[PDB]
């Protein structure tokens, strides 16, 4: 258990595609390895671990890791990425099976999954609730993974990056970004700007 490194702090992959997260270690004693995942809200959760037995360790949520002594490696794979897998993953190493022994962790690998958008129809809509006030809100939505948003060039106009949602009972997914300003001179027909697709509806 001396050190651990995780080459690649960020991995994005399409839903359905192969997931692979590097972990490599140095140890002057026989190593005990672990993979942990950390989901948005929750604390560290053990995915799998290598004790001095099986070389190919099956973990939870369809994950697997091969311990390779020859290369000082313990890479985490799953052949088919799922949206639920988005998360940060951490390789760790110990000198003993004894819980006694301290874990030294890698730097972490952020996993991002890109949704396969079956039937895209990009639209920029407006929504002005009449409840409180300042209702000046523009939803860019139903667009395709390939498309990207750049944060606004004007200071009074707030824009959030794209976000993926899942309406599980219709097996339907959608990307959305949001735009807004208290500026009376602000309109949704031009709230968003960069690399916007010709067929966008209004």
């Amino acid at each position: 258990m001396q050190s651990v490194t995780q080459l690649g702090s960020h991995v994005s992959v399409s839903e359905g595609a192969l997931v692979l997260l590097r972990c490599n270690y140095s140890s002057s004693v026989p190593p005990y390895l672990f993979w942990y995942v950390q989901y948005p809200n929750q604390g560290l959760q053990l995915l799998l671990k290598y004790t001095s037995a099986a070389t190919l360790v099956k973990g939870i949520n369809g994950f697997e890791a091969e311990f390779k002594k020859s290369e000082t490696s313990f890479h985490l794979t799953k052949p088919s990425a799922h949206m639920s897998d988005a998360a940060e993953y951490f390789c760790a190493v110990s000198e003993s099976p004894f819980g006694n022994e301290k874990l030294t962790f890698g730097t972490g690998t952020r996993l991002t999954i890109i949704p396969n958008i079956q039937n895209p129809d990009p639209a920029v809509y407006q929504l002005r609730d009449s409840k409180s006030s300042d209702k000046s809100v523009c939803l860019f939505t139903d667009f395709d993974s390939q498309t990207n948003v750049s944060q606004s060039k004007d200071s009074d106009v707030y824009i959030t990056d794209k976000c993926v949602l899942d309406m599980r009972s219709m097996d339907f997914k959608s990307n959305s970004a949001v735009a807004w300003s208290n500026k009376s001179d602000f309109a949704c027909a031009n709230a968003f700007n960069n690399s916007i697709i010709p067929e966008d509806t209004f």
Binding site: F34, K131, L139, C163, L165
Partner: protein
């Protein structure tokens, strides 16, 4: 089987001395304190292998620890600096048993030098575009927690008394309402989508819930506005045709 930590968020002035409490009911010999920081993984500050017994980890500079009963591992920061702003994670384990480490859920510590200029979020909710309902037959409501600091909110959606995950997306990082301002406030957006009928039925109840973690009872407030304690600020709406 629960390692529990004092609290989950915390706001503290540069120079203050700070007590982080980690407790466990499991009768464990070993307790560890790590900090976690975007890009540097988890780094061990201090550990302890029995009552009264401590040891430096890889990064103890600036920290001191206290193991005083078997169950509790308090972490002390002598003089809170902005770069002790971190997620602090406690863990516990048994020497004999094979189950390894159990982790607490964490505590996020933000140190700022400011007249505790922490603000609770204001929360606005935005009814669906009529356009979307006609073109897509789905309806996206949007929520907006605005005017908060530090970055300490947990935004959930509630329908007819039950919290709902299916249909939601919240930004993972908030945006600076004023990027230039060193200790600027943040905003954060979330979206909730359902079928059009579910929205064009006035029996259906739609609330945006936002939990803010600011000040506790120990902290002192004299300013001429409500004390920005840990609270929940919400907005609501109903189905409609």
């Amino acid at each position: 089987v629960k390692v529990t930590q004092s609290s989950r968020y915390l706001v503290k002035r540069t120079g203050e001395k700070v007590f982080l409490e980690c407790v466990q009911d499991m009768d464990h010999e070993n307790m560890f304190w790590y900090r976690q920081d975007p890009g540097l993984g988890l780094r061990l500050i201090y550990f302890s292998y029995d009552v009264k017994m401590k040891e430096k980890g890889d990064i103890p500079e600036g920290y001191s620890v206290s193991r005083e009963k078997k169950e509790r591992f308090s972490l002390i920061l002598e003089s809170a600096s902005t770069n002790q702003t971190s997620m602090y994670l406690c863990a516990s384990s048994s020497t004999g048993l094979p189950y390894g480490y159990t982790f607490g859920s964490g505590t996020r510590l933000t140190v700022v030098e400011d007249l505790n200029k922490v603000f609770p979020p204001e929360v606005a909710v935005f009814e669906p575009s009529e356009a979307e309902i006609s073109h897509t037959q789905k309806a996206t409501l949007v929520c907006l927690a605005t005017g908060f600091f530090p970055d300490h909110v947990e935004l959930s959606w509630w329908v007819n008394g039950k919290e709902v995950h299916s249909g939601v997306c919240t930004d993972p990082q908030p945006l600076k309402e004023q990027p230039a301002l060193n200790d600027s406030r943040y905003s954060l957006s979330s979206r909730l989508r359902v079928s059009a009928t579910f929205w064009q039925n006035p029996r259906n109840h739609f609330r945006c819930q936002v939990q803010f973690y600011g000040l506790s009872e120990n902290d002192e407030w004299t300013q001429d506005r409500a004390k920005p304690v840990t609270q929940i600020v919400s907005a609501e709406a109903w189905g409609r045709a």
